[PDB]
Design a protein around this ligand. Structure first.
Ligand SMILES: CC(=O)N[C@@H]1[C@@H](O)C(C/C=C/c2ccc(C)cc2)=C(C(=O)O)O[C@H]1C(O)[C@H](O)CO
Ligand SMILES: CC(=O)N[C@@H]1[C@@H](O)C(C/C=C/c2ccc(C)cc2)=C(C(=O)O)O[C@H]1C(O)[C@H](O)CO
Ligand SMILES: CC(=O)N[C@@H]1[C@@H](O)C(C/C=C/c2ccc(C)cc2)=C(C(=O)O)O[C@H]1C(O)[C@H](O)CO
Ligand SMILES: CC(=O)N[C@@H]1[C@@H](O)C(C/C=C/c2ccc(C)cc2)=C(C(=O)O)O[C@H]1C(O)[C@H](O)CO
Lengths: 387, 387, 387, 387
């Protein structure tokens, strides 16, 4: 039975801790992969944490980290949400140095991209077996969400980018059923730049808040119809949520176009709340440290800078990183709307650390109809390690 | 199908060993969490040992134990009853530095409390996903049973405390269905103090024997109706079962009010046997060492000090600690009454030990229609460790 | 659905390797329990290796082995046949320093005996939960098979001994359903001594070949009816199969009475083949080394010393030990008779070894309608270990 | 429900990465078996990697590798495709120093061969239990595919060799149902030599591309009917695919007979594509390094040397080794043809390496209707190890 993810995103006042893996603390003595991008997606029965590994373990010479991001050993695997990415619990998912995964109600579909920059291949997996493929269409590091993809009534949608990391690149929407690609679209966005989309379902369409690594410190937004017709632009709120970025004051709200001089960014997320938006951002405007989440009134649809809520989850004395969106299956939340959730990656080691290695632990938050107090559920690991 | 836990508690003569995890002996070389409160609850299919971890492993720098009880890394996880709390077998349950868990017949519901003392949040999980929330209602370390909660015909009940550890605090009963809070009550108990309740079902109501950390060396008792109306008071028996506590002689039996001067205590349990009670207590009146279990005639309903049975399970040359109650699903025991069971936590390391670290192993006992001989199934670990 | 184990034992010509765990070789670097008695029993779906642990791991101070056989930390756990007894795969079964287990077709029933020598308790588990009990009835180290017990049409039978290890002791047959004891019998056997029975089903009755630790170098045999009426005596074959024991020549075949002067013995097994018997024995008449299996014509029913087959499985340059019987569920073998199988324990370390520790690996053989060549599938471990 | 593997092999243009285990990199700190022959077969629900172990772990004295190939400790076990052969995830399969495995749609059947060279036994397992046997029929290291065997409509077929490794030997086809041998054939092939067959299903028959260790640098091919009547010969393509071997030029294409002087070889594979063939081979003509896969027009049926496609998967600066074939169940690929897949073993340590030990990691590729770019997904391990 397929998942109906046609409902509205629940209107949440605040966010409660879902899980914490303590991966890096644990891996000081145990056998934990050195990972990145601990993103989360849910089947109708359980949620899982997907992650990329370098095939190495914490506290081992192979965590040496001079190793390349897009290496032949990079792989997507997964554990149950909250469990650390240890070797024993781990489920192999795909050969990938960039990935997205989502479950459609029947089986999991994942997408690993691997091979060479000039002609990468992205393998689609369905039920733990390759079913289809996409080749670099522009010859420049083909890549995708690094966050849950989105399944609406049996068909799954995700977004990919093939092109330069700075200047103008190319962007497409893909649509699969049972692991077979059945539709695709080019996304026109001159001046605009899209990467590492954080997507969720809403009112029967797919909404993403992505990353502009070229020109904007506000985040791109697109909204995908099931016919692959789409709207695209920026998150209207007059508050910048990329990293790095400038003061909110020094700031302009653009539904239309990138806003700040800054290049570069980090993966982030945001949830549409009617007209308001829950936006996430690092606390530091310059480094990936601390993590908070602001609610802005009419932020989805206007250049608003009216904060209704500020909720800290990682304090600014602590490292954060990537963040992403995902929804709770109705068939678990019990609710009648789609409970919005998100994960926060917390990175330790290089570059900000004395260590030969770099990994991250995660922490997951969900929905909830109440204000939740500010706290920091930071990583915790005592660096450096035996090495 | 929901669990009918409406039956009577079986009338047991003695207690047989259910399981022993040997966690700490095992963790001298293996990868075992450093835990506390190894409590037990049962689904209609298996029993599990829940525990709080600090995200660290035995024999690792992170077991350093200068780390705080209510840390951001504290989590509830679980294994099958008898298995050690090792990293590989472990199932993530919740972000919690205080917890209760119970299964209702369909799925597990757990409750982790985390965040800051002044405004903690308690997240309710159902089927391994947050479904609801409770915020500190009195701003003073919100907390709960540290032992199995109680599900009667689809609805689960547990008890929480928000307030000072010594003086007067506040106490409430909560009632959930399918992970949704559907009722709550304030518990009036001036002069009285309640913490770490050990609860089981009986005659369709919920009976707990809790901890008074203020004023009494006898244990509070409450009895909850499914309408959240309740009786509350003390365990009548004229024998003290808190720790620390005075001689049984020097002692008075109060159904009504706290009895000894002593402040402080430890989590304990007791089972109503018609009018008699099975009460547990440490052997040492002063330290948490040794563990025995006495049956007192008319102890539930009178200031009785008539011992029918004394049964040792941990000898007084050995460390004990927390203890708690839980019931065996009829759908496993095969019986027509609810077989009473309990766990005994055995603590090693700080403060009574030379070590940088503190954890505990457990041992579980059940029901049974026979006198069982005295023995000690103590922890066993050879301290200190490689460190 | 219960198991019908009413069929005849298949008439097998030879024995094929089923599994080898390599536990001790593996545990030189991995996390393997230090075990004894790796016996095997089968559900209608899989076979498992049960074992007693001391709660310790190989290559760890706790394997120190000055620790007592009947310690408070001794436990029965289990893995899938062929897997090593590692900590991660292990399933907790019971608190036991002596045990038997069998599956009846619906669930597993195990029996762990623990507590003090003068008043041990034997806990019966059904579906992984205690359901019943037996107390020492003679106050002298209550004990049982250390090998698969036997389930015939929903009811399971095993044998226990309470008494001295040398001189005359006491012996009983027990009969359970769904973990509830429903019948028991005293076994009259003056002059005779019974221990560590290896039992299998056959023609609707239960046949065992046990251990005489008092007076006989031939093995006791009993045959249990479902009404707990029984025949008992010795294995007629005119060849001794206990260890230690004398030359086969220097030997007499007694259906009736113990045969050689020797005291002591080891756990062994044998399968009735119409009138013939497959008997197992160590190769060395004096030490537990090497292991072979002889077929003797009319050995079940006569003082025969006619060898039809000799098949070596462990050569006499290698350590062996306990051995035991078990049957393959028809619902797996596919056959119409019960395929006879047996396990051989191979012991390393103390007393015959330089080491602080003692454990064993195993190797399992089955049925088969063909002569299988002689070989040695010995333990393999390179002693001593890092220590 | 049995598997219908009667369909045609899909016509694939190129091959996409399925999985990579990173076993050896991972085993630098974790607990990974030292293995060989990481072959792959699929049930209707999941694919698994089977492997032979020596019972030892990487970075342990027992990996010492002076140990013999056909040792008493050699065993077949298995994990989910992509997972490393670690001790915790591992499923015991059989006592084997040579093996094949295939699933028929209901259960897995495996075949381990063990015992002595002069009279080896091959045990057939069905549903994880021995069901049948084959003894050395020629007294000279009985052996088999080391790759997936083949199940067509409930009946499984594989090929075995009993005889010399060089000169003429003997070859047979076996046919089992539910683990019971129900047919066998001798394969007449004078001048010809067959070993380590890589087989898949196609048009309702079984096609293999095997290894000639005697005389030919082209690969033997046979095609088995369900009646065990067969055709046999060589792969016609005028290009040599054994290792070692000579230039393609210096080369002749023989459908009939072995082609080059060279003795010796390595296990390899090939897929019939109508009349064309996908053939695999090491890049180095002399050593087992690098791995590519060529498509040759009319190569199945003619002495053709027309390359349509060359696709590298391991570059010639890196070690390769054994390779083998397997099919994707329709009941997973979703397609209407059988998607051809293959695994490549990558060997590290002795003989080409400074180390006391030898193991291999693997990498798996599948079907796909597109050209996939050249890359190298080589092993990755940093030799030598702590030792
Ligand atoms: C496919 C791919 O390259 N995607 C990139 C992804 O890998 C990461 C993540 C890094 C993991 C990592 C780990 C250890 C070290 C020492 C260094 C890096 C980042 C990032 O911004 O952090 O950027 C993506 C990217 O380049 C941009 O989007 C611009 O196009
Ligand atoms: C939420 C919370 O704080 N609950 C407390 C709970 O954590 C523990 C257990 C301790 C684990 C631990 C472990 C290592 C070390 C070095 C120190 C402590 C105890 C206890 O009495 O032992 O008391 C609860 C408590 O404070 C009282 O009930 C009074 O209100
Ligand atoms: C309940 C109980 O004591 N059963 C005994 C059982 O434990 C064992 C097995 C020993 C394991 C072990 C391991 C490490 C060391 C250093 C020493 C011993 C043996 C045996 O004959 O080997 O004998 C049973 C027995 O005493 C007799 O049947 C006579 O009555
Ligand atoms: C049953 C059996 O012996 N089959 C052989 C098989 O074992 C292997 C694989 C070796 C594993 C290995 C591992 C570590 C070391 C130090 C040495 C070897 C090879 C091979 O060609 O590589 O050849 C098979 C063979 O002899 C031929 O087909 C000729 O008949």
């Amino acid at each position: 039975t397929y998942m109906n993810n046609t409902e509205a995103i629940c209107d949440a006042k605040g966010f409660a801790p879902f899980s914490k893996d303590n991966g890096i603390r644990i891996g000081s003595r145990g056998h934990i992969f050195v990972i990145r991008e601990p993103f989360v997606s849910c089947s109708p029965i359980e949620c899982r944490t997907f992650f990329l590994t370098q095939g190495s373990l914490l506290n081992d010479k192979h965590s040496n980290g001079t190793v390349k991001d897009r290496s032949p050993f990079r792989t997507l695997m997964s554990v149950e949400v909250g469990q650390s990415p240890n070797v024993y619990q781990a489920r192999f998912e795909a050969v990938a140095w960039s990935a997205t995964a989502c479950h459609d109600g029947k089986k999991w579909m994942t997408v690993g991209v691997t091979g060479p920059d000039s002609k990468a291949v992205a393998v689609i997996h369905y039920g733990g077996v390759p079913t289809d493929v996409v080749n670099s269409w522009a010859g420049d590091i083909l890549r995708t969400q690094e966050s849950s993809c989105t399944c609406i009534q049996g068909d799954c949608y995700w977004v990919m980018t093939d092109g330069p990391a700075n200047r103008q690149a190319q962007y497409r929407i893909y649509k699969a059923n049972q692991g077979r690609i059945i539709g695709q679209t080019d996304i026109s966005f001159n001046g605009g730049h899209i990467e590492e989309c954080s997507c969720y379902p809403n009112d029967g369409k797919v909404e993403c808040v992505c990353r502009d690594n070229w020109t904007g410190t506000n985040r791109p937004v697109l909204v995908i119809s099931p016919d692959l017709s789409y709207r695209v632009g920026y998150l209207c709120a007059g508050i910048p949520s990329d990293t790095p970025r400038g003061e909110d004051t020094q700031f302009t709200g653009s539904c239309t176009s990138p806003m700040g001089n800054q290049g570069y960014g980090v993966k982030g997320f945001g949830f549409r709340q009617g007209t308001d938006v829950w936006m996430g951002r690092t606390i530091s405007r310059t480094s990936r440290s601390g993590f908070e989440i602001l609610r802005i009134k009419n932020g989805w649809t206007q250049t608003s800078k009216e904060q209704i809520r500020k909720q800290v989850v990682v304090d600014n004395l602590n490292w954060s990183g990537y963040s992403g969106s995902f929804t709770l299956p109705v068939e678990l939340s019990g609710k009648d709307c789609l409970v919005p959730c998100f994960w926060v990656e917390m990175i330790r080691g290089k570059p900000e650390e004395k260590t030969i290695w770099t990994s991250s632990s995660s922490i997951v938050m969900c929905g909830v109809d109440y204000e939740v107090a500010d706290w920091s559920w930071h990583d915790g690991a005592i660096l450096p390690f035996d090495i």
